[PDB]
């Protein structure tokens, strides 16, 4: 029926939009000062990309990004929102006396109608590990409304990946799973499910931050150029890597973060979720290897991170890595939709 409904199980959609229908959940994003403040700076400091222009806000939520477009002088902003947060945005448009400049359009950006083409698309559709939620595809989809030579804010996104060593985090998985390695849990031998429990815990990406000293090699970068990319380009994401190891140790997995850039007429502003930068509500993401790899400084850790889109608005992640000097190899499968939120 729509591009959205074809790639998305209803069960997932329903829960996804319920989440965003909570004022508490919109509030959580708004309160990330790094996020919200950087969006405001990027828009305001590139005021010429907005002054008297026509704007589309893809997934406007409370409307906050659309108000920043108004602050920068846009003539007309179409704010599209699929969740019931749409009504709340409409209330704020009226109470801020902007009915003539911001028009809220309830529904999916894949399904609504705009009355005209726009000069610039604004959105915040980055999930944890960048790709989660598959809203990047809705943002790309929206370019059907973009005038030729229209801009996108953000303009590009970069994923970073780097090998890490973290013995304590790795060990925490077997600790959890060894609950099942009891021969008499209230008289019951649970041992047969221990292997399954381990696989379950290792399939969860870990969302939290960490000291940069755990990183063992300089990151590789994979880039999406939102001006040029097609939706289809995000269904299968292949990220080859060849890490030149800077430190010797046990590699326990790969760490991920992401930056986006707003490339405007006056300047480029970056929003970074890197472990060197102040913390955001995205944290960072780590994918463990169930069999870790010994590598010495100067070795090469080669392989591929393959992200395959699924119908639950996320990705199946396949990471395969080897140390070239020894041939020792590790394969791992993760479910991006089911992360472990380890931060306190």
């Amino acid at each position: 029926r729509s591009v959205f409904s074809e790639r998305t199980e209803e069960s997932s959609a329903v829960q996804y939009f319920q989440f965003y229908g909570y004022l508490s959940q919109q509030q959580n994003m708004m309160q990330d000062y790094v996020r919200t403040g950087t969006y405001q700076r990027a828009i305001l400091q590139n005021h010429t990309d907005f002054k008297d222009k026509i704007v589309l806000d893809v997934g406007c939520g409370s409307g906050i990004l659309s108000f920043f477009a108004a602050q920068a002088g846009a003539r007309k902003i179409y704010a599209v929102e699929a969740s019931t947060m749409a009504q709340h945005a409409e209330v704020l448009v009226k109470s801020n006396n902007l009915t003539d400049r911001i028009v809220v359009i309830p529904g999916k950006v894949e399904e609504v109608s705009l009355p005209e083409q726009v000069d610039i698309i604004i959105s915040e559709p980055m999930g944890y590990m960048l790709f989660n939620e598959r809203m990047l595809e809705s943002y790309l989809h929206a370019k059907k409304y973009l005038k030729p030579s229209g801009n996108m804010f953000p303009t590009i996104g970069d994923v970073h990946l780097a090998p890490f060593t973290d013995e304590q985090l790795y060990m925490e998985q077997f600790t959890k799973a060894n609950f099942w390695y009891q021969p008499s849990f209230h008289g019951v031998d649970l041992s047969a499910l221990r292997g399954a429990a381990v696989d379950e815990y290792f399939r969860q990406p870990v969302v939290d931050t960490f000291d940069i000293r755990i990183l063992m090699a300089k990151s590789v970068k994979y880039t999406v150029n939102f001006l040029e990319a097609k939706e289809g380009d995000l269904h299968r994401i292949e990220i080859p890597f060849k890490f030149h190891m800077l430190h010797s140790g046990l590699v326990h997995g790969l760490a991920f973060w992401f930056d986006v850039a707003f490339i405007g007429s006056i300047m480029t502003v970056w929003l970074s979720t890197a472990p060197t930068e102040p913390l955001t509500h995205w944290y960072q993401v780590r994918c463990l290897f169930q069999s870790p790899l010994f590598a010495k400084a100067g070795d090469t850790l080669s392989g591929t991170c393959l992200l395959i889109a699924n119908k639950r608005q996320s990705y199946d992640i396949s990471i395969v890595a080897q140390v070239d000097q020894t041939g020792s190899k590790s394969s791992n499968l993760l479910d991006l939709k089911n992360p472990f939120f380890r931060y306190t």
Partner: peptide, 10 residues
């Protein structure tokens, strides 16, 4: 069913 993690606290 957590889509977005909680913003880090002051």
């Amino acid at each position: 069913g957590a889509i977005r993690p909680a913003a880090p606290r002051p």
